[PDB]
Amino acid sequence: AAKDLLKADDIKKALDAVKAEGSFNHKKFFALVGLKAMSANDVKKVFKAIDADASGFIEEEELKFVLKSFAADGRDLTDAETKAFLKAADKDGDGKIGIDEFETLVHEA
Ligand SMILES: [Ca+2]
Ligand SMILES: [Ca+2]
């Protein structure tokens, strides 16, 4: 979904910016990849891409592999990057990310 939804050149730019281990910031990533200005309806389509097992939530293991939803060659996130992303996104503290939490995170910038 993500690569159909989003500009190829945006994706390359976003992935380039977070190449170095430790450099992933969700706010910067969302802005560069082009998710920031997208409608809730369209952000939902990206969410479903990241929700690999179709559970309805992005749980921690899926967050670690978030970059592979944008490029198959996307690196894993580090433990710290994963924890930082999870803490920012998981608004209710239940350990995983629901759609409405994801929507809010994308648009809170
Ligand atoms: Ca899931
Ligand atoms: Ca949650």
UniProtKB/Swiss-Prot annotation:
Q: Which sites bind Ca(2+) 2?
A: D90, D92, D94, K96, E101
What does the UniProt keyword field contain?
Acetylation, Calcium, Metal-binding, Muscle protein, Repeat
What SUPFAM superfamilies is this protein classified in? EF-hand
Question: What name does the UniProt record give this protein?
Answer: Parvalbumin alpha
This protein's source sits in the domain of life called Eukaryota
Gene3D superfamilies, A to Z: EF-hand
Pfam families assigned: EF-hand_7
Concerning its family, UniProt says: Belongs to the parvalbumin family.
N-acetylalanine is found on A2
Q: Name all EF-hand domain ranges.
A: 38-73, 77-109
One GO cellular component this record assigns the protein to is: cytoplasm
Q: Extra info from the record?
A: This is the major component, having an isoelectric point of 5.0.
User: Which annotated residues bind Ca(2+) 1?
Assistant: D51, D53, S55, F57, E59, E62
GO molecular function per UniProt? calcium ion binding
PANTHER family for this protein:
PARVALBUMIN ALPHA, PARVALBUMIN-7
Which Cys-Cys disulphide bridges does the record give? none
Q: Which InterPro entries match?
A: EF-hand-dom_pair, EF_Hand_1_Ca_BS, EF_hand_dom, Parvalbumin
Q: What does this protein do?
A: In muscle, parvalbumin is thought to be involved in relaxation after contraction. It binds two calcium ions.
